[PDB]
Design a protein around this ligand. Structure first.
Ligand SMILES: *[C@@H]1O[C@H](CO)[C@@H](O)[C@H](O)[C@H]1NC(C)=O
Ligand SMILES: *[C@@H]1O[C@H](CO)[C@@H](O)[C@H](O)[C@H]1NC(C)=O
Ligand SMILES: *[C@@H]1O[C@H](CO)[C@@H](O)[C@H](O)[C@H]1NC(C)=O
Ligand SMILES: *[C@@H]1O[C@H](CO)[C@@H](O)[C@H](O)[C@H]1NC(C)=O
Ligand SMILES: *[C@@H]1O[C@H](CO)[C@@H](O)[C@H](O)[C@H]1NC(C)=O
Ligand SMILES: *[C@@H]1O[C@H](CO)[C@@H](O)[C@H](O)[C@H]1NC(C)=O
Ligand SMILES: *[C@@H]1O[C@H](CO)[C@@H](O)[C@H](O)[C@H]1NC(C)=O
Ligand SMILES: *[C@@H]1O[C@H](CO)[C@@H](O)[C@H](O)[C@H]1NC(C)=O
Ligand SMILES: *[C@@H]1O[C@H](CO)[C@@H](O)[C@H](O)[C@H]1NC(C)=O
Ligand SMILES: *[C@@H]1O[C@H](CO)[C@@H](O)[C@H](O)[C@H]1NC(C)=O
Length: 342
């Protein structure tokens, strides 16, 4: 028997000690080895309540990723709280690895196995585990990359759909590849992401259908982010250590929901000067490495903000972008909660 509790988790990974890649290096020192024979017990006729929006596992993962980034991604110049910090900024090897989140003795993690669980409320099919699945700490905006997929239907998740200020996480049930490249050989910061338009528009159509179920069949309209920093108005992510900013206007194309089944090519740029997602200020990095810089990722989730004040109209307008990296972890941790064992 148990009760919802918070405690300090630890992490486990398969980091390689000989690797210089920074997530490996961090996990080699900050985490223990994974369990090759992990226990998972189904809790017979047990119903548990979960609330992904109030889940300290998220705050803890955020804490780790901040620490990882802080010790791994030194910029040449950091502008924070009005001070200027200068230091060496060598190119690094960067490629996220899965990190498992684990309970210490006297606690356990309950996992909701209801396939269509929306993240808050009762779960009928619950199991207990010592660690979460391995979650890659992929930092991005607008699109969630290399994550886990919903096992059945597309799921719409929100702390309160009625409140337009609350971010919506769209959990996809089918991956769509996004293939980003800064080609080897003009402009060294010019890059692009290629997406399969037929596949992407099919999924986006489905997301639209799902949104209708939640918004009384109102008309669903996508628009580009209203304004803000580039990290939010663009799909922002890190590829091989380089900070990419990609224009997603083409991805949220209302008319495709004409002959538009071809490759979607998003224009991207690599930026040396960025606003740190940690919310701490600005950083400047060295220019991109030479050669073909390339990441192919699965889009597995979408972060959306709904326009407020549209209650009198027959439309609901959505714009890509969540307002919080914690939501990235939320999207992976929603099915977990820590409890204390009696
Ligand atoms: C509950 O979830 C488990 C693990 O995901 C799955 O294998 C099983 O089919 C489900 N069990 C029940 C009682 O439906
Ligand atoms: C999720 O399901 C719960 C059932 O308890 C419901 O109360 C809540 O409104 C739902 N949220 C969404 C976004 O569907
Ligand atoms: C990408 O998604 C595919 C298909 O759903 C999956 O098989 C593969 O593991 C994913 N690759 C990742 C997570 O890097
Ligand atoms: C994904 O979910 C949608 C609607 O939520 C559904 O129509 C479709 O069957 C699902 N696709 C897969 C591959 O499970
Ligand atoms: C959900 O948001 C609506 C609109 O802001 C608000 O009126 C209502 O009180 C909220 N519900 C909860 C439980 O916060
Ligand atoms: C990614 O895009 C480039 C073309 O721009 C191509 O060289 C490469 O083969 C692509 N990779 C995949 C897996 O589609
Ligand atoms: C997208 O995938 C479909 C298969 O559903 C394929 O027919 C098409 O060649 C792909 N489109 C592009 C241009 O990548
Ligand atoms: C994205 O691209 C569109 C069309 O090319 C452009 O008008 C828009 O301003 C771009 N968005 C950003 C934030 O650069
Ligand atoms: C939507 O797609 C069509 C392609 O047929 C194109 O005319 C239009 O420019 C697109 N809107 C975008 C990409 O913003
Ligand atoms: C997604 O995972 C693939 C396979 O490990 C990797 O090549 C790609 O760069 C990852 N994307 C991001 C943004 O980390």
């Amino acid at each position: 028997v148990w009760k919802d509790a918070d405690t300090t988790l630890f992490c486990a990974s398969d980091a390689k000690a000989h690797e210089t890649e920074v997530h490996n290096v961090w996990a080699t020192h900050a985490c223990v080895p994974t369990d090759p024979n992990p226990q998972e017990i189904h809790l017979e006729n047990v119903t548990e309540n979960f609330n992904m929006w109030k889940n300290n596992m998220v705050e803890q993962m955020q804490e780790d990723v901040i620490s990882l980034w802080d010790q791994s991604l030194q910029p040449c110049v950091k502008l924070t709280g009005g001070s200027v910090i200068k230091q060496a900024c060598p190119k690094i090897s960067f490629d996220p690895i899965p990190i498992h989140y684990c309970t210490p003795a006297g606690y356990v993690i309950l996992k909701c196995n209801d396939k269509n669980f929306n993240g808050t409320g009762p779960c009928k099919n619950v199991s207990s585990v010592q660690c979460t699945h391995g979650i890659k700490p992929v930092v991005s905006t607008q699109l969630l990359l290399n994550g886990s997929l919903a096992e059945e239907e597309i799921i719409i998740r929100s702390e309160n759909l009625t409140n337009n200020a609350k971010t919506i996480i769209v959990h996809l049930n089918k991956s769509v590849e996004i293939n980003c490249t800064r080609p080897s050989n003009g402009d060294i910061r010019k890059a692009y992401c290629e997406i399969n338009g037929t596949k992407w528009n099919k999924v986006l159509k489905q997301v639209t259908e799902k949104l209708k179920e939640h918004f009384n069949n109102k008309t669903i309209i996508f628009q580009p982010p209203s304004g803000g920093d580039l990290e939010i108005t663009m799909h922002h992510f890190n590829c091989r250590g380089e900070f990419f900013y990609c224009n997603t206007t083409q991805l949220f194309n209302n008319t495709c929901i004409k002959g538009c089944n071809g490759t979607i090519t998003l224009p991207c740029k690599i930026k040396q000067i960025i606003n740190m997602w940690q919310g701490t200020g600005q950083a400047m990095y060295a220019p991109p490495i030479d050669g073909k810089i390339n990441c192919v990722s699965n889009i597995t989730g979408i972060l959306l903000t709904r326009d407020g004040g549209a209650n009198n109209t027959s439309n609901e307008t959505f714009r890509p972008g969540g307002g919080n990296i914690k939501d990235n972890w939320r999207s992976e941790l929603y099915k977990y909660k820590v409890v204390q064992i009696e």
